[PDB]
Amino acid sequence: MSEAKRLAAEKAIEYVEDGMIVGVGTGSTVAYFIDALARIQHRIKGAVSSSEQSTARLKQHGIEVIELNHSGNLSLYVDGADECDANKCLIKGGGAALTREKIIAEASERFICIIDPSKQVPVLGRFPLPVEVIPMARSLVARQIRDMTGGQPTWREGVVTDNGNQILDIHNLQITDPEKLERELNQLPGVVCVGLFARRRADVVIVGGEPPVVL
Template sequence: MNKKFFAAEGAFDEINDSNDNINIGIGTGSTTTIFINEFLPNLKNRINTIFSSSNESTELLENLQFEVSQGAPENFLLDYYIDGADEIDKNYYLIKGGGGAHTKEKILAAASKKFICIVDDSKQVEILGTFPLPIEVIPFAEHSVRRNLGNM
């Protein structure tokens, strides 16, 4: 077992102490994949609703017979949003979104009572910026964003 496994196990322990009828959001990435495959099945009977930030995670969840809700949560907050990060500093500031699901990750995190970030020490940095800063741009704004980024 590796550090990512133990980080994912910590997320499971946090959620396992909660009540039944859990509403959760799931992110994407290597540590989140470990959480989905190794620990989430143990919570299956206690999960009311599950949302996914990526096609990759949705496929993993559906392969485990989870029914993934489509769209964003509307009339309630998720109890938890579980995801990894690309970098984390000593102040717990993060760089996220390198897996290409940044916008959905932000929506699910904002719709959650608690964000559980599962990272191991390989993600710790002194100063953020070792990992490229991800951005997502809607098609409508592509040209203006390119122009503005090019002027930086």
């Protein structure tokens, strides 16, 4: 899907305007966007980064990285998704960076989501739902999620997020109501972030291909 990823990333460049501080996602599709952004870096002020990995990639291209606390709100955030449904609700966090992704997206006027066709699904959940948890809460949250959803939480054992937390991946869900599930999981003490983007979903979905399809 490398060509589809690159084509989606190049289409997203059309949304970058002179003088922007661009919010930058994480992952293999975003890698193509970082490479393309480097070619126009004379036109931008810099980037706010959703992961230490993305920060290193931006810096390797000479792009200035700015903290969200310093930039304030942004106009544009570009990132990928592990799954995207027909209502533009997403599962994110396959690379464990969901928390800073969700924060930067929240601070951005428009979220342009770049995907290849394999990410389009009719019902979220075949890709397990990532949930970032305070480590000492891990087993409690797993029990609660099992009780609430009937899904199967599994610790992504050994993975530590940029924020020092652990990840539970919730298997076997059919998330037909992501708005509700996100709101309910957000209430559990020890949950740091839920990998559903539904309260604040993608504004634009770019599906890579020749030509890209813009939803």
